[model samples]
Target: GKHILVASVKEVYSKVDQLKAGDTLLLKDGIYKDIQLVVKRSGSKEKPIVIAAQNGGKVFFTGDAKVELRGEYLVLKDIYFKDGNRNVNQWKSHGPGLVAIYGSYNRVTGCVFNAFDEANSAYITTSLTEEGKVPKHCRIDHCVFTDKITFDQVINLNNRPRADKESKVLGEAMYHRIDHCFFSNPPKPGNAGGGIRVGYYRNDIGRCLIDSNLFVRQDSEAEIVTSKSQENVYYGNTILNCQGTLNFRHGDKQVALNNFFISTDNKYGYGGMFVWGSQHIIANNYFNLKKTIKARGNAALYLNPGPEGSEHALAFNSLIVNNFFDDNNGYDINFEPLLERRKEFAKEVNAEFKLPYNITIEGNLFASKQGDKHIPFLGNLDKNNLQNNYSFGQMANDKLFTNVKPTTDGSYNPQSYKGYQLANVKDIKNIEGIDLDIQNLINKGIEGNPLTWNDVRPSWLVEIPGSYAKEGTLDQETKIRFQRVLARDRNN
Candidate 1:
């Protein structure tokens, strides 16, 4: 009854049948080395089985393991999933490289998921397949999912849709608390599926909260989609480089607030964040897209008039409030307020098709170059293209202009890059001011690449391979990509 203690992850995992309430299964430090962990039973509500990292130290899950779960009060923390030096040529038919968690009443906190899938890979934090099935009330907080790129450098995700359509295989989850995580890419020829991707379940995902995460893109895409939703909330996050087109595909009554979108990929996609649900709130966010090469393409905010299935609900009240848009080239906000076109597009897909209207765009900041470039307002969203519903203002927070040359471009210079670091520092100490890195801001004084705007590398992103430990038993190709994640900008 008093915190029963077991020695190793192997001891606790193999002896799970003997575990009881108030029992603590502790994993020793160092590698559990290439083990597939399974938790197939539930514990009592009051005294749930507790599996935790020993003494707040890290419990690294090295090598490839399809860790499965079906338990209650199962607490997993300070763990790392690193797939080292695995080959991709073999992943032509492999599933998620590591961890395919199932069931519910569990917590995977302060962990990291580092598998290198492509711009469109199928692996997920948790992928759901059946109808009305959900992984309930799980808390995955302070975790990180980055270094997910495709192994094949020559494979184009858009062209050979069938070959890499795994990214399209969607699922739904509910009541998940995903907070303070990082989803990024490794330096490579390609990228992964959009960041914090949410999709696939047809009427299942309800009351999921996606908050407080930083998504930095070294490549093309980053997004959160919904096939159908009871209700979802996305707040307090930063989305970088959501430029891949078609971000935020669908949902019902989804609210996105206090977020920021910083795109450097292209002008048109102020990173392709769409609103595909009814009763939605898109408010208090920031979208920055400057230095655009073209004049007509840049859009800080793009809104689709929902989809086809729920075209009748086009009158549903949707609110866009207190957001900031910076379009360097043109069109701060682009509204594709087409119901029929959306219907035709969403008909084949097994997703909710709700046309959007009753929209309120108030108290927002929309800025672009004043003279030569202009912010285009789509007049087709409302019944009368209701001019009174939308609002626009100037930059109130930062002095940086969307469509203007950077004044701070040559002002500051970065000294050096201390290189890549780990995202999970539960075991590491004093991460607040730790100087584990050796170099930084390699673009300092480099003509076009400004130093003032350069951001620090996330502690989770390892610049060099030796910085982190090996993850679960990964395929050689996946391991190869994992090591090179964030090595370069894959936006091109």
Candidate 2:
């Protein structure tokens, strides 16, 4: 029975249902208005119910106030969530998130969630509850999501899929964990601001774990983190100057490891990473580019094939292994196979069916500055699919296919490539100080402060010697969890 003090917002909504477990509700600094909270109360896992922030002053939350953590063993700390606004049909098609998570092992740490411009909802949302009830082991760490992204997804983990047909095996929204958060820059731009959108298109979202986040200048939508469901695990992140990074579309065994997709200046329109449906494993990542625009649909890996129904096809088996391609301008892997008949003498006939039934590009490493105009390899749908493909570099074009091998037996075992593999492979060469770690996280935002913790700890939190692909490396456990949360005296 360990109780603590300082409440308000109507004394914690009249004691939120007699909160207990190991009570500790703080909240006392300033700016608070029209709040509407709900926390069904239920703390156990060895007494868990600590809602923090008491002394270190500066606390803000204004207008249409909405905060719902339908409660389980909750632990929301260092609060900040910002000035709200709702109505575009009050949450459009249910895209809640001015702090909305519907329950199950909850945890929102060192928060800051600013300006949730609800042009159509979503500055944080998690679902499951029209009887199917989901939202398991949740966790959103060291937060900071930036300003006004008018429509869908500023973190919308919607788990809506099964529409009957025998309850469609109902099961999604599993082991969640969005670590070391800080997604900035999104004042407005096209596809209506998005940055972290998982699951949808009739559900399948899996083993979630978006680690070590950063994602600054998220290029105002077109997907800076969108994997519409399945075995998700996007690790060790850092996506700067983002125009369009990661967008797996549908899903299946998805696993984008050891990340970092940098694209600096060129009138921003960079488009890297976009794979469609099936066993994916875009391994040991790192796609750096400076300029490349030729009717841009650029690629530091863009594999498409999966159109024309059958639940949207493409992806019979996929695996683009051991990655690391430093491009000066584009095409380091772009396979577009969704053709439909035509062209003779100049050869180019296909008429429908002929998608990636098998795609395997091995042990990668391609560096180009501009010869062959930024070519590292492949683009004419690999010259009309030379027999359900497999490639291992060295192609200046001889109809592009260099010794197609790999049915696995070399021990990187992922069920020996019946699909996706990259268990572990690090022989790095870049990512050393990534342009001063993207200019110190886009100059640690501060215009109306409230993102302290020394602006999300720097020096890339230690350890960066690199050979490349430290597969989701967690720089010394993020410097021992921010030195054990700044050694107690919290201002985070």
TM-score top scorer: 1
Angstrom error at residue 472, model 1: 24
In the range 335-378, model 2's lDDT, one tens digit per residue, is 65233321121133233543565665654445444555555554
> Each model's C-alpha lDDT?
0.46, 0.57
Highest lDDT model number = 2
As a TM-score, model 1 comes out at 0.64
Model 1 per-residue lDDT tens digits across residues 1-492? 545555565676677677676676667666666566777666666776766666443466655444555566666666666543333333441233244445566666666656523223333344332343445666666666654554321111111112222244333345666666654543333333444444333233445666666555423232333223435666556665533332444445565656666655553333535555455656556666653212223455556654432422232456665455545444665565454666665665545665445666544444444543354454344432222221223432223222222324321111111221111111211111122211121111111221111132223434412212122134466655544443422332
Task: Find the number of clashing residue pairs for candidate 1.
Answer: 47
Q: After superposition, how far is residue 31 of candidate 1 from its true place, in Å?
A: 1.3
Per-model tally of clashing residue pairs: 47, 8
